[PDB]
Amino acid sequence: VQLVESGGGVVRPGGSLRLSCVASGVTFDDYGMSWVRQAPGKGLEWVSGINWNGGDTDYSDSVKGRFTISRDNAKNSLYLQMNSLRAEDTALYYCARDFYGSGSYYHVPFDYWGQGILVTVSSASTKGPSVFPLAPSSTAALGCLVKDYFPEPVTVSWNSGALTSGVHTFPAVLQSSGLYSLSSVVTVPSSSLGTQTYICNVNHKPSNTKVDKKVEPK
Amino acid sequence: XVQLXXSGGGXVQXGXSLXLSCXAXXXXXXXXXXXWXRQXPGXXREXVXXXXXXXXXXXXXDSXXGRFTXSXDXXXXXXXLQXXXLXXXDXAXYYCXXXXXXXXXXXXXXWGXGTXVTVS
Amino acid sequence: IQGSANYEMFIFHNGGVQILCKYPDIVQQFKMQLLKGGQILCDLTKTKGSGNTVSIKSLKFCHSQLSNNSVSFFLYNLDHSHANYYFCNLSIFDPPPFKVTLTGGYLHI
Amino acid sequence: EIVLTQSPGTLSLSPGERATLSCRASQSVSRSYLAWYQQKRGQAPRLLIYGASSRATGIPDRFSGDGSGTDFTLSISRLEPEDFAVYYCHQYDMSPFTFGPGTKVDIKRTVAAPSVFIFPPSDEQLKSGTASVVCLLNNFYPREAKVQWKVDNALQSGNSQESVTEQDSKDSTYSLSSTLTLSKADYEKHKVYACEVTHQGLSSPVTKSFNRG
Ligand SMILES: *[C@@H]1O[C@H](CO)[C@@H](O)[C@H](O)[C@H]1NC(C)=O
């Protein structure tokens, strides 16, 4: 069996997206389906549910007026139409089915398919990051600050991969402006800090940006 | 007045055992983590162990990992530290401290006067 | 076990036969299949939504009548060739746990 | 709606030990419609238990559980390395169907105090009109630690953002980075900038501070 999930991506508030989960080697009419989302770094939120023929649906209040769950059994497809999108709709959306194939979405256990469809709702425009140094002083630590970029993600290496010990690249954070920022630090012996050149290579493909910043004990 | 009173310290031959007690007053210890630290002459006060709330488990330092055991008696509002296989470098003044943060961030706001443990 | 029902699944009217397939009183959502010679004649699935609306899925055509404790299938145009073993295959979906039971009988003689 | 809470927030155990996770509901939930799911990093949730005590098909017998009304429990008889993940309880008795915040099971190890470092904003960023001062807590365990920003010995709030790494594959330790963001105008008004760190492996809070200039 193979599952194809699509329809997500980056959208502005007020835009629209149709998510789709298509299953190949299963009988679609046996399973009630549902959509459950997970906001970045948070828990699970049940969004919608539908029965075997689509004659019965249910929604959570957070999406009740804006999202529409539907299905096409002949095409083995499950759709989530999303209008009036808000920034708080940004999440990974999983499609799920009732485990024992009852055709119900209610009072039956559910299990999840695939890896999830990423949906990011933001008013921001695609922007390359600014890379600033985080200079050591006085075992010492140094690093780089990748700031004001959109959208996720960015790849941060050190000396094009030659330095991997003690590297900590932290998860990004969403700021008030709508842009992302993260930090990448390296721990080194203070003896080796003397006279060695440390490079952070930031690559942000949505912006097609590549910056190679050198950090110095200023 | 929040008060911690440590006791049970004394002289021990190398390789023997000793049980320290820390009795708490004016705070319900069943809601907070209780930690043992130690200080040797001319050295910094070192972390020994921490007993969090019941079911939240106990954590230890590398120096006393397999030899020490922290326990609690919330009915007696007391904490206890069992010390086995004592070495000469375990000689120190042992203090207990109360973490004021229920989320276990170590707002150690109250300490005991300490008890001396000498191993020779 | 043998698969024998503790009752007679066959009620006789003039035209054909009424096959009675019972299920526990507590069962809310289930699938009931009628099997002749290991071959499916009828497929009935009862589900309910969050608004207590009942959906009765029956893809293969078959005259069925439901009660809160049983399911009756009605078979017509019966000759001597249709004397065979008949089985109720019950799959319970609600309440848990999932459970498949089979009762059965022999129709003629 | 029915709110589900989970205890504890983080479970610290060793491989091969037994685990007990608790779920509580704001009101009585039907025993028949409670489930436990497991989520590994980057993976979708995985149905473990349904109907409070029934085990899903293909789920090892080391997972069990039960409960009723307000309180339910998921028991793991021995922790295999794949089981140090997140666990959610889920009620589908009354719409909307809700989940608990989740319980994480992490590898237990010895207490390591955090190494504290501070990084002042660069003149490159300074000329842009914004300054970011970064405080770093490195290689500490357990996870609980508090960071406070002081600007001229005054507690800051509402202008700091923290980020934590995952438990290291070899260290079993964590690392945290706090970013304090101030406009150039506000940054040039003050002199000394400090981050104060407290952690259960510390007898006193460790303050790392620099003077502007
Ligand atoms: C009874 O129905 C279940 C569910 O469809 C099926 O798995 C099982 O094979 C059936 N039993 C028989 C004897 O047909």
Residue numbers in the entry:
A (entry chain H): 2 to 52, 52A, 53 to 82, 82A, 82B, 82C, 83 to 100, 100A, ...
B (entry chain K): 1 to 120
C (entry chain C): 22 to 130
D (entry chain L): 1 to 27, 27A, 28 to 212
Please, what does the article write about this entry?
ICOS (CD278) is a type I transmembrane glycoprotein that belongs to the CD28 family of co-stimulatory immunoreceptors. On the other hand, ICOS-L (CD275) belongs to the B7 family and is expressed on the surface of APCs5,7,8 and non-hematopoietic cells under inflammatory conditions. Binding of ICOS-L to ICOS triggers distinct intracellular signaling cascades through the conserved motifs YMFM13, IProx14, and KKKY15 in the ICOS cytoplasmic tail. These signaling pathways deliver the co-stimulatory signals that promote T cell activation and differentiation.
Monoclonal antibodies STIM003 and prezalumab target ICOS and ICOS-L, respectively and are currently under clinical evaluation. Using BLI, we confirmed that binding of these antibodies to their respective ligands prevents the formation of the ICOS/ICOS-L immune complex. To elucidate the molecular basis of ligand blockade by the antibodies, we solved the crystal structures of ICOS/STIM003 Fab and ICOS-L/prezalumab Fab complexes at 2.38 and 3.15 Å resolution, respectively. Superposition of the ICOS structure, when crystallized in complex with its natural ligand and in complex with STIM003, showed high structural similarity (backbone r.m.s.d of 0.90 Å). The binding interface of ICOS in the antibody complex was strikingly similar to the one when bound to its natural ligand. In both cases, binding is concentrated in the FG loop of ICOS. However, the total buried surface area of ICOS is slightly higher for the STIM003 interaction in comparison to the interaction with ICOS-L (800 to 620 Å2, respectively), due to additional interactions of the antibody with the C’C” loop and the C” strand. Despite the high similarity of the contacted ICOS surface, ICOS-L and STIM003 approach the receptor with different angles of approach. Consequently, the ICOS N110 glycan minimally interferes with binding to STIM003. Prezalumab uses the heavy chain complementary determining region (CDR) 3 (HCDR3) to mimic the central ICOS FG loop that engages with ICOS-L. On the other hand, HCDR3, LCDR1, and LCDR2 residues of STIM003 resemble the hydrophobic residues of the ICOS-L front sheet that drive the interaction with ICOS.
